[PDB]
Amino acid sequence: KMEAKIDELINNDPVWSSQNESLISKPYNHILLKRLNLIVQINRVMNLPKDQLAIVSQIVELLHNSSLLIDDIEDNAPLRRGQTTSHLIFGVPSTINTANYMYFRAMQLVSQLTTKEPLYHNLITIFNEELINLHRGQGLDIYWRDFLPEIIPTQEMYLNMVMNKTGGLFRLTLRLMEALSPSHSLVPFINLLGIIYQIRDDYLNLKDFQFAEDITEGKLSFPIVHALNFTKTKGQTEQHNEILRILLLRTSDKDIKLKLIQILEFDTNSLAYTKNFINQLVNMIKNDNENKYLP
Amino acid sequence: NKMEAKIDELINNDPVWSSQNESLISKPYNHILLKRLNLIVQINRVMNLPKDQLAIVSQIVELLHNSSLLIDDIEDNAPLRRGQTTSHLIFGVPSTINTANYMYFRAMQLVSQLTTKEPLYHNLITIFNEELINLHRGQGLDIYWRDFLPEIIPTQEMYLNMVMNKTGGLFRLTLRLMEALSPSHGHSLVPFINLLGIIYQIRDDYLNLKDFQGFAEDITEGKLSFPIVHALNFTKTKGQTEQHNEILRILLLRTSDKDIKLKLIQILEFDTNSLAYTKNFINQLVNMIKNDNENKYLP
Ligand SMILES: CC(C)=CCC/C(C)=C/CC/C(C)=C/CSP(=O)(O)OP(=O)(O)O
Ligand SMILES: CC(C)=CCC/C(C)=C/CC/C(C)=C/CSP(=O)(O)OP(=O)(O)O
Ligand SMILES: C=C(C)CCOP(=O)(O)OP(=O)(O)O
Ligand SMILES: C=C(C)CCOP(=O)(O)OP(=O)(O)O
Ligand SMILES: [Mg+2]
Ligand SMILES: [Mg+2]
Ligand SMILES: [Mg+2]
Ligand SMILES: [Mg+2]
């Protein structure tokens, strides 16, 4: 009877049940109890039909939530949107696998946006290209952090890193939408929005504390990049080294975290230099009277 | 206004990526390379893809398999792979996950160098997508059963389904890509490749302990391997309560103590007779192929 069961098995597609699907989805569902608006809004110009716009939205939602699951493991984050990160509940093993599984489920949804073989290819190429960019950006962010102080990035290296890491999903959402549109490309505008988005995230992480987790993580955030480069240039060796020492401590010590922020506030004035940089990027749009970036 | 021109030149160009940066993030992958082409070569005696196309299928499968291992070793807390220190322990779990995930997309990107025919490309991508989904399903079950033990004690049937997904995934991927590219051949060889993946996994599980009675790292990992699955079901079934619980206890210690690992192996050897059951089960599967004159599995 043994041979018979093996025969049945190898001749059928692999078995997968609804219950199993549930087991593997747990780390993902956990983060769901936590961007669409932007798609809505941009559609007032792309006017994709609603059921197709929904799939796009579902694809962006899978990639985004899955990327955070992985990012929190990569950043040793204890919290995300006020709750315990999934890896601390389901373990790093299941969370990595679930997140990665969701990347491929998102991919499968791509083949359901169209049956037109020419267009499908483009949708897949876009998906593939931006996922590649996302990992390149994320890899560099991680590399600088984990090899510190081997390489201290410049503002320009940081901006290119951000174009990959944060612009990736913004560009993916948008490029899909433009290729599907039944009706000037908006990628430049979405690139700039991604950059603004990331620098703002980096700024707020320190400003709402002054958790300041970026310090505990030892992240080469926009203000840290500024401060490190500012002290190096003004030959303020000791402050330069003090910033590195605190980042390398990977500390959760509130007093130490505060010490580093005061360095950026009083010494380099990096927080105020960032605030101004963000405003300078937003003004590039507030003053886009020629509508060169805006629609 | 120069910063503005700078911001303007950037957002209006593709993101910048150097070969230097490509090397820096490829470290985890390059390390595992220092450690498959035969089975592809044989099957091609049947499929006959031109050599240049067969070399791309090969690079794809090589990228997926290697990246798969990088990830698997993090998931299994493995200190060694092919006799060498695991990449996550050298470059860290963060870079290793990211790099392995990056290589999954590099592999996907290669699917396009295989054809210029749109209908076929679409099929190659679907196969790629399908089996990667299958791989993650099996791997997800292997991991859940282990980290949540004893929430679920898988039966022999459940383990085989998990392995059909987990190990048979890459085998089927490679074969389905080749069958779809073949310009040449008979009944699909999928059932045979499924059997090969199943025999392959059970052998991996078996050897992992028989070579200790290697370092029986599957025990330290707490893996619901084929012999362990037999032992846990056999004990429940035979009323060996204390033994059933002791198997669970050892698995949950995640121990590196060789005597404790050795006690467990001898429990499988003399008490549940799981090692012999597995050896014989392997033979019986191998016998389904060898005793195949009507070629219902083999080409
Ligand atoms: C599927 C997909 C989009 C990408 C795949 C590769 C990955 C994981 C990219 C990272 C994407 C994200 C959310 C980056 C922000 S890290 P951060 O600096 O924002 O850390 P934080 O958001 O502040 O916690
Ligand atoms: C991209 C791809 C191929 C798969 C994606 C999903 C993954 C990571 C599947 C895992 C497949 C492998 C190599 C498992 C080995 S654990 P084991 O029980 O086989 O023991 P081992 O470490 O291999 O000896
Ligand atoms: C990964 C970064 C930098 C932010 C992504 O969007 P948000 O994280 O700010 O939005 P939600 O996940 O809270 O929905
Ligand atoms: C169960 C899996 C996937 C690994 C088994 O050994 P491999 O066939 O992977 O051997 P090498 O990759 O080390 O050559
Ligand atoms: Mg993070
Ligand atoms: Mg991060
Ligand atoms: Mg393993
Ligand atoms: Mg494993």
Curated annotation (Swiss-Prot), chain B:
Co-factor remark: Binds 2 Mg(2+) ions per subunit.
Keywords linked to the UniProt accession: Carotenoid biosynthesis, Cytoplasm, Isoprene biosynthesis, Magnesium, Metal-binding, Protein transport, Transferase, Transport
Record-level GO cellular component terms: mitochondrion
Protein residues bound to isopentenyl diphosphate: R36, H65, R82
Binding positions for Mg(2+) 2 per the UniProt entry: D72, D76
MF terms (GO), sorted A to Z: (2E,6E)-farnesyl diphosphate synthase activity; dimethylallyltranstransferase activity; geranylgeranyl diphosphate synthase activity; metal ion binding
Subcellular location: Cytoplasm
Job description of the protein: Catalyzes the trans-addition of the 3 molecules of IPP onto DMAPP to form geranylgeranyl pyrophosphate. Required for the membrane attachment of YPT1 and SEC4. May be involved in vesicle trafficking and protein sorting.
Protein name: Geranylgeranyl pyrophosphate synthase BTS1
Organism: Saccharomyces cerevisiae (strain ATCC 204508 / S288c)
